[PDB]
Design a protein around this ligand. Sequence first.
Ligand SMILES: CC(=O)N[C@H]1[C@H]([C@H](O)[C@H](O)CO)O[C@@](OC2[C@@H](O)[C@H](O)O[C@H](CO)[C@@H]2O)(C(=O)O)C[C@@H]1O
Ligand SMILES: CC(=O)N[C@H]1[C@H]([C@H](O)[C@H](O)CO)O[C@@](OC2[C@@H](O)[C@H](O)O[C@H](CO)[C@@H]2O)(C(=O)O)C[C@@H]1O
Ligand SMILES: CC(=O)N[C@H]1[C@H]([C@H](O)[C@H](O)CO)O[C@@](OC2[C@@H](O)[C@H](O)O[C@H](CO)[C@@H]2O)(C(=O)O)C[C@@H]1O
Lengths: 123, 117, 117, 182, 182, 182
Amino acid sequence: ARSLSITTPEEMIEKAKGETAYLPCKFTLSPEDQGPLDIEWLISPADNQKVDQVIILYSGDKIYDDYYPDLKGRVHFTSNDLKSGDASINVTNLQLSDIGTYQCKVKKAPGVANKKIHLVVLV
Amino acid sequence: SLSITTPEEMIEKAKGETAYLPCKFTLSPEDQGPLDIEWLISPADNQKVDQVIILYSGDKIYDDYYPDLKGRVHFTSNDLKSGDASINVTNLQLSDIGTYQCKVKKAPGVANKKIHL
Amino acid sequence: SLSITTPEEMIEKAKGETAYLPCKFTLSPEDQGPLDIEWLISPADNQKVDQVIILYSGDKIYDDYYPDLKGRVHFTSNDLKSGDASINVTNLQLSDIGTYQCKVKKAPGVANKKIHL
Amino acid sequence: APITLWTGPGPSINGFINDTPVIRCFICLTRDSNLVTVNASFVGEGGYRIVSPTQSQFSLIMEFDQFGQLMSTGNINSTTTWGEKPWGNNTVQPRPSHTWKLCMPNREVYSTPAATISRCGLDSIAVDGAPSRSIDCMLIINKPKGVATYTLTFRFLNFNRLSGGTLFKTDVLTFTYVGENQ
Amino acid sequence: APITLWTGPGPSINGFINDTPVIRCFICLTRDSNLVTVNASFVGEGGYRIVSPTQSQFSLIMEFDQFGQLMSTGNINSTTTWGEKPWGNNTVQPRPSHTWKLCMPNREVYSTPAATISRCGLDSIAVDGAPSRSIDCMLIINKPKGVATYTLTFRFLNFNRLSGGTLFKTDVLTFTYVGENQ
Amino acid sequence: APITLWTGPGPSINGFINDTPVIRCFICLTRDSNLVTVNASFVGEGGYRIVSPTQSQFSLIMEFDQFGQLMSTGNINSTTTWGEKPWGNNTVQPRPSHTWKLCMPNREVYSTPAATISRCGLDSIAVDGAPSRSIDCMLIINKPKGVATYTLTFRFLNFNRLSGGTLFKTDVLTFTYVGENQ
Ligand SMILES: CC(=O)N[C@H]1[C@H]([C@H](O)[C@H](O)CO)O[C@@](OC2[C@@H](O)[C@H](O)O[C@H](CO)[C@@H]2O)(C(=O)O)C[C@@H]1O
Ligand SMILES: CC(=O)N[C@H]1[C@H]([C@H](O)[C@H](O)CO)O[C@@](OC2[C@@H](O)[C@H](O)O[C@H](CO)[C@@H]2O)(C(=O)O)C[C@@H]1O
Ligand SMILES: CC(=O)N[C@H]1[C@H]([C@H](O)[C@H](O)CO)O[C@@](OC2[C@@H](O)[C@H](O)O[C@H](CO)[C@@H]2O)(C(=O)O)C[C@@H]1O
């Protein structure tokens, strides 16, 4: 449509411990969004003070996924057609300490959009 | 604009007397900032030039600033925002010999008067 | 605009001679700034490059900048202002081998010339 | 278009520390195409004319509303001479304009507080720039305070660098930040 | 006419060290009549979130072509969001213009590299500007690199000044250089 | 309108210490809406090519008349290339204009001298910003000198900070002051 945007930009998600959480981040570009595609996911965990820690990055056609120790190896982009409008991720084997607000920031200049998912984990 | 009646003067007084130092001023309608007066002193006593002695801002008098003149300097007018920022300095003594200056701001208005005692 | 005739040339000379390095220039009426001349040397001998040896500034010569050339650099024309910044380098040694640059400014004009010796 | 807010030349004692004007602050906020340049200098008066190495640190906070108008509540505030400098003269124009917002720190860029800690020489000419006659002054951009939308804080620190009592006559300080959009 | 190139607000992890994006660089190059003001700040991420005194120094080089377009080869490069800031909003416009050259360092003035080494406070608000919590940041103008025509290098130095582990959250830094002619 | 006065690129040896040109001063005074930015750098020559820790301090004074024209009497003076930089090229235009006054320090703001003492790195790229390779440079605005109306003084201080002999090749320095009104 007319500019860069995400579908359903706010959302809760409840899963039980051990299940995986599918965090959707689907977005549309406009012709004028001629910049480099520049995705990142961030986490504000509830458990501790810190806010907006990086978990995963897509930049220059490569995925950097090392950043948040606790989530090591459990976060993955879900769509191998990422450049067409799908920043969705999976968090597998949910922990109790995964409770927090997960944020998806998508940039392709002059476009910017973001979406937050408050994720909760039960027993 | 903002200006003061007789911007330069000299005043002769003997020890002990109190000295009246006029600073009557006119405002203009343009002058919509806050009223902002200070008196300073250039004593012939020291090299020191332009030390604050008494202040007026936020409709409030601050006076404690110059050691030698503590408790002996005060504003004469009961309505200072009318245009009268005159002070008198009571119980004169020879160390008070110098050039007293009255700056009066009321944005964009600005003016000042020198008096030698 | 300010120009120097023959901006590049090779000059060859064995020991003990007196090298004449021409740097003659034409001004134009635009050029209203002070005449500001510099000669530099980029020696083949060592590391460093672009080293001041002599200058003309505010109608006065300053000549002792390069220790190795001390005393053996002089301006030739006793009328530089007219357009002759040429210099002499007397009693040549083999250590003098290199590129001699001539920068002439007269705001807004600027021009330079190189000479391989 | 550019715009400058300032105290004017020969500033009044406009810097309060515990309800007493004690610092004479010259402050100039000049907005050009995109950045705002803070050009400021300070002179202590009364008990703050001379500061010693045991002087405790302090903040002089300017609080601005959402339209770039200086509020009454900060250490430096609307009760003293403050306003726009017209190009061409040294007057202080108090009548607010919508352009005043352009001098404020861009609230999206500075959505969390930013800081610059610079050296701040004291009585530098007189003491001939002696190394142990410098303190530090830190600008804090948009630290929240009360109901202010924008804030600028001059925070004076590390007086214990001083070798002894020093006339509190600061250098001209310069900072820079991204200005707010109209 | 003036012109600003920048990363935009809330910048991505756009700064690469040893092939991994680790520094979050806010960089703003504003050209007014003649000079370019570099206004920049940095936040470390991952292994670079906290730096210790034994941290080894490093350079973040921006490489630009002869028309002022950021190249893909530097530590900060065209693979991340970078472009023009329109007066009036905080967008980043990637479509290049001939005016972009005006933000480059004048190649005749800086025909050999120039440098400015500034103090660079880390986590300054939180540590209250403690003196041993500053490192140094040196801007290098036009040091040759690869086939770039213009370069800007932020080189972070002297981490051994730090009294201990410090959050790598830099102050706002400001530098200045003469801009290139159209 | 804005205006820049400068020495041009590749400056001549234009700085006098003791009746002899020894410092190569690049100086650029850019006036935008309200402030003037001083952007300057210095390179020593002859006996001043290398300076040692025992080097005694010195001032390079620029003296200007009431119309912003550089006078012949300062350490940096009208006998060397100095003038206006046109937007669009690197020439130096010597023909004076009434606009030149706009580069001068506002004589009401600076009715008594003001100063900024900044760190000044020497040979910073080569020595990799080693801490003990910085001296200080202090700008003094409007210190009276002879019959000059405006003065700018670059005063180089505290050479005893140097760990040893250092190439006198300064960083790019940046200062700021309020410009004079037309
Ligand atoms: C010299 C002095 O008074 N220093 C104290 C300082 C100043 O009073 C204010 O900064 C003036 O603006 O206040 C100090 O702490 C604070 C604030 O941080 C806090 O918000 O409120 C307290 C009151 O409990 C006090 O204002 C400071 O700035 O460090 C303490 C200084 O010693
Ligand atoms: C923290 C770190 O990795 N420091 C090394 C540093 C960085 O990797 C780069 O600055 C990355 O931008 O590189 C250091 O030196 C260099 C280059 O200057 C040189 O051209 O080549 C060498 C290898 O031969 C290396 O890349 C540096 O800049 O200091 C070494 C740091 O330890
Ligand atoms: C390297 C050197 O010669 N330093 C001396 C310095 C310089 O010559 C000047 O600064 C050059 O402009 O002069 C010093 O003192 C001064 C002046 O400051 C003073 O006004 O007049 C005296 C003569 O009585 C002398 O010129 C200085 O400024 O520090 C002395 C330095 O040794």
